[PDB]
Amino acid sequence: MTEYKLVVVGAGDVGKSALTIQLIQNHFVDEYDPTEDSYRKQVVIDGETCLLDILDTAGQEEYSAMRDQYMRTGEGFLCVFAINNTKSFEDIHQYREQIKRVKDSDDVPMVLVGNKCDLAARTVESRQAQDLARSYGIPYIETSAKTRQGVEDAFYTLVREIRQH
Ligand SMILES: Nc1nc2c(ncn2[C@@H]2O[C@H](COP(=O)(O)OP(=O)(O)O)[C@@H](O)[C@H]2O)c(=O)[nH]1
Ligand SMILES: [Mg+2]
């Protein structure tokens, strides 16, 4: 059993907790804002039996006892913005820079996640986020914590990025 420590970061309100809860507990956080838990789930991924630790961090606008500790321990990161929140997408760069600083490494397993892809209108274009992720050298995956679309894709891609590291 290999343990994978995955950290979800991003600005407030983008769906960090919704995504984590959707993956671990298979239901949609229709406003249940936890106040930065940690989660574990045993799952078989690509024939490997894994223990996933999901560390759900708070945005930099909010008090957080554990975000710095969660970030130092994490092996891979989901960098999450909401496709209807332009500031959240602009904040991605700070979040990535800080991950690189805490891990003391430029080659940290990461996935850029554009969440809320269920929505009818958006202010951040896929092409933008794909170009930014390309410049970072990481995958871009669009997700919906509401519909569960792409959620396992995001988290498992992170796991496979950790395996390649
Ligand atoms: N429509 C839609 N709403 C979402 C999605 N993910 C989160 N939300 C909503 O966005 C708000 C903030 O979600 P939350 O998980 O607490 O974001 P966090 O602050 O980053 O942890 C909540 O009201 C959620 O119901 C999504 O994929 N689609
Ligand atoms: Mg949250």
Number of domains: 1
Order of helices and strands: EHEEHEHEHEH
Q: If you consult CATH, what is the topology?
A: Rossmann fold
Bound molecules: guanosine-5'-diphosphate, magnesium ion
* Radius of gyration, in angstroms, nearest whole number: 14 Å
Class, according to the CATH hierarchy? Alpha Beta
Percent strand equals: 25-35%
Largest sheet: 6 strands, mixed
- Which CATH architecture? 3-Layer(aba) Sandwich
Total helices: the number is: 5
The multimeric state of the shown protein is monomer
EC number: 3.6.5.2
Modified residues (S-nitrosocysteine): 117
Membrane topology: Lipid-anchor
Protein name: GTPase HRas
Quick summary of this structure?
With 165 residues, the chain is of the alpha/beta class. Helix content is 36%, strand content 25%.
Report what the structure shows.
The protein is 36% helix and 25% strand. Strands 2-3-1-4-5-6 form a six-stranded mixed beta sheet, sandwiched between helices. It is α/β, with parallel strands linked by helices. It is globular and about 40 Å long. The protein has a single domain (1-165), classed as P-loop containing nucleotide triphosphate hydrolases (Rossmann fold, 3-Layer(aba) Sandwich). It is built from five helices and six strands, in the order E-H-E-E-H-E-H-E-H-E-H. The longest helix is centred in the middle third of the chain and has 17 residues, at 86-102. Bound molecules: guanosine-5'-diphosphate (GDP) and magnesium ion (MG).
